[PDB]
Design a protein around this motif. Structure first.
Motif, PDB file in Angstrom:
ATOM      1  N   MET A   1     -14.452  31.189  15.580  1.00  0.00           N
ATOM      2  CA  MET A   1     -15.512  30.967  14.605  1.00  0.00           C
ATOM      3  C   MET A   1     -16.889  31.132  15.233  1.00  0.00           C
ATOM      4  SD  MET A   1     -15.694  26.838  14.208  1.00  0.00           S
ATOM      5  CE  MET A   1     -15.123  27.034  12.529  1.00  0.00           C
ATOM      6  N   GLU A   2     -17.007  30.890  16.540  1.00  0.00           N
ATOM      7  CA  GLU A   2     -18.295  31.034  17.209  1.00  0.00           C
ATOM      8  C   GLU A   2     -18.791  32.475  17.156  1.00  0.00           C
ATOM      9  OE1 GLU A   2     -18.822  28.949  20.871  1.00  0.00           O
ATOM     10  OE2 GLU A   2     -20.981  29.251  20.571  1.00  0.00           O
TER      11      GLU A   2
ATOM     12  N   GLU B   1     -17.596  34.794  14.832  1.00  0.00           N
ATOM     13  CA  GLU B   1     -17.819  34.941  13.399  1.00  0.00           C
ATOM     14  C   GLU B   1     -19.190  34.405  13.010  1.00  0.00           C
ATOM     15  OE1 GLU B   1     -15.166  32.797  10.665  1.00  0.00           O
ATOM     16  OE2 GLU B   1     -16.337  33.831   9.122  1.00  0.00           O
ATOM     17  N   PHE B   2     -19.617  33.313  13.650  1.00  0.00           N
ATOM     18  CA  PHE B   2     -20.900  32.698  13.324  1.00  0.00           C
ATOM     19  C   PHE B   2     -22.061  33.613  13.696  1.00  0.00           C
ATOM     20  CE2 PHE B   2     -23.626  29.091  12.501  1.00  0.00           C
ATOM     21  CZ  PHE B   2     -24.712  29.327  13.318  1.00  0.00           C
TER      22      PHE B   2
ATOM     23  N   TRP C   1     -25.041  34.957   4.982  1.00  0.00           N
ATOM     24  CA  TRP C   1     -24.507  33.650   4.612  1.00  0.00           C
ATOM     25  C   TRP C   1     -24.373  33.512   3.102  1.00  0.00           C
ATOM     26  CZ3 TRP C   1     -21.874  30.733   7.627  1.00  0.00           C
ATOM     27  CH2 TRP C   1     -22.117  30.724   9.009  1.00  0.00           C
TER      28      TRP C   1
ATOM     29  N   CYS D   1     -11.412  20.031  10.346  1.00  0.00           N
ATOM     30  CA  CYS D   1     -11.356  21.193  11.247  1.00  0.00           C
ATOM     31  C   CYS D   1     -11.239  20.760  12.717  1.00  0.00           C
ATOM     32  CB  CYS D   1     -12.589  22.070  11.056  1.00  0.00           C
ATOM     33  SG  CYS D   1     -12.616  23.126   9.554  1.00  0.00           S
TER      34      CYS D   1
ATOM     35  N   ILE E   1     -12.331  27.974   9.057  1.00  0.00           N
ATOM     36  CA  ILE E   1     -13.065  26.966   8.284  1.00  0.00           C
ATOM     37  C   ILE E   1     -13.133  27.348   6.806  1.00  0.00           C
ATOM     38  CG2 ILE E   1     -15.233  28.034   9.048  1.00  0.00           C
ATOM     39  CD1 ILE E   1     -16.437  25.176   8.941  1.00  0.00           C
ATOM     40  N   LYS E   2     -13.239  28.646   6.494  1.00  0.00           N
ATOM     41  CA  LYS E   2     -13.268  29.067   5.094  1.00  0.00           C
ATOM     42  C   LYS E   2     -11.948  28.770   4.394  1.00  0.00           C
ATOM     43  CE  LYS E   2     -14.995  33.398   6.457  1.00  0.00           C
ATOM     44  NZ  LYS E   2     -13.634  33.264   7.059  1.00  0.00           N
TER      45      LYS E   2
ATOM     46  N   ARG F   1     -23.373  27.049   6.588  1.00  0.00           N
ATOM     47  CA  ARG F   1     -23.757  27.341   7.967  1.00  0.00           C
ATOM     48  C   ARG F   1     -23.795  26.080   8.812  1.00  0.00           C
ATOM     49  NH1 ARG F   1     -28.416  27.611  11.273  1.00  0.00           N
ATOM     50  NH2 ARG F   1     -28.260  29.353  12.750  1.00  0.00           N
TER      51      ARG F   1
ATOM     52  N   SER G   1     -22.022  23.407   8.453  1.00  0.00           N
ATOM     53  CA  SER G   1     -20.651  22.982   8.726  1.00  0.00           C
ATOM     54  C   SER G   1     -20.062  23.765   9.898  1.00  0.00           C
ATOM     55  CB  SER G   1     -19.791  23.161   7.478  1.00  0.00           C
ATOM     56  OG  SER G   1     -20.220  22.330   6.409  1.00  0.00           O
ATOM     57  N   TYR G   2     -20.258  25.089   9.911  1.00  0.00           N
ATOM     58  CA  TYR G   2     -19.868  25.884  11.074  1.00  0.00           C
ATOM     59  C   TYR G   2     -20.497  25.332  12.350  1.00  0.00           C
ATOM     60  CZ  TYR G   2     -17.760  30.164   8.915  1.00  0.00           C
ATOM     61  OH  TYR G   2     -16.950  31.071   8.277  1.00  0.00           O
TER      62      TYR G   2
END
Length: 284
Positions: free
Chosen positions: A3-4, A6-7, A16, A231, A246-247, A268, A270-271
């Motif tokens: 996810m990092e 992906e972020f 976003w 998560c 997370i999605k 964002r 939450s990520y």
């Protein structure tokens, strides 16, 4: 996909709003017929935020069993949460009836009573030890036992007494007091510190009923709290923590209550909270 990465990918491409609208389009739609009955109009804060019938919490009374509250049951993570709106003048007695009947140990409050110059929920707990509250419609008494005020949150010990049976229980009130009137916090550090204080108290653990968590509508900040908690627990439990999506977790949670995470900024944030919190779960 980690996810990092992906972020950073979403951040550099500034997409976003596009990601968030995809979630809105794929989210579940289930009936909420009980919430819309005419007898329940003054039990709902917002016309467009309602519990689904299949997951709503029922009050144990024959009269009217309705409260705007939902059970979010996360099967792989082995965590449950009750998400609810901030209580209204006419539903403060129902709120504490639910806490009693569901055997909850903790209440998590993520709003201030007044924000942006308007009332966001009732003053539903006592502010002074010697001035207790009695809820006559549901036959409960609530007393303030102690208060610990910190820079970013306040923790209160409360005594709830069922006046019908004279049983008493200790309830912990965890009040995050510094979410900004507009937007989201710049850093997730104080929100994560708060989450860990709730965890440390036992309020999220399976020996108690589900924690009750609320903001004003019970979907935005409240959704951020449960999404981040679930998560992080999954990253602890799995062989491959980078497999946590997370999605997909958010869409699972939206099977149980509509509208969780209200803006692309909340998504964002939450990520960010999960990425930074993982640098304790994984061992650092």
């Amino acid at each position: 996909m980690e996810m990092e990465k992906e972020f950073e990918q979403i951040d550099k491409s500034g997409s976003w709003a596009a990601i968030y609208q995809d979630i809105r389009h794929e989210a579940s739609d289930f009936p909420s017929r009980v919430a819309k009955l005419p007898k329940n109009k003054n039990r709902n804060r917002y016309r467009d935020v309602s519990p689904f019938d299949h997951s709503r919490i029922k009050l144990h009374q024959e009269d009217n069993d309705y409260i705007n509250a939902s059970l979010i049951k996360m099967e792989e993570a082995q965590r449950s949460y009750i998400l609810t709106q901030g209580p209204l003048p006419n539903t403060v007695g129902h709120f504490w009836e639910m806490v009693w009947e569901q055997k909850s140990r903790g209440v998590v409050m993520l709003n201030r009573v007044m924000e942006k110059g308007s009332l966001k929920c009732a003053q539903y707990w006592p502010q002074k030890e010697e001035k207790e509250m009695i809820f006559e419609d549901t036959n409960l008494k609530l007393t303030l036992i102690s208060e610990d005020i910190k820079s970013y949150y306040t923790v209160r010990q409360l005594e709830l007494e069922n006046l019908t049976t004279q049983e008493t229980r200790e309830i912990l009130h965890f009040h995050y007091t510094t979410w900004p009137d507009f937007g989201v916090p710049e850093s997730p550090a104080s929100f994560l510190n708060f989450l860990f204080k709730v965890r440390e108290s036992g309020s999220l653990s399976p020996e108690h009923g589900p924690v009750v968590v609320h903001c004003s509508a019970g979907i935005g900040r409240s959704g951020t709290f449960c999404l981040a908690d679930t998560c992080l627990l999954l990253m602890d439990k799995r062989k491959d923590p980078s497999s946590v999506d997370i999605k997909k977790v958010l869409l699972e949670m939206r099977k149980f209550r509509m509208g969780l995470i209200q803006t692309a900024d909340q998504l964002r944030f939450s990520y960010l909270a999960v990425i930074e919190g993982a640098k304790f779960i994984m061992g650092d």
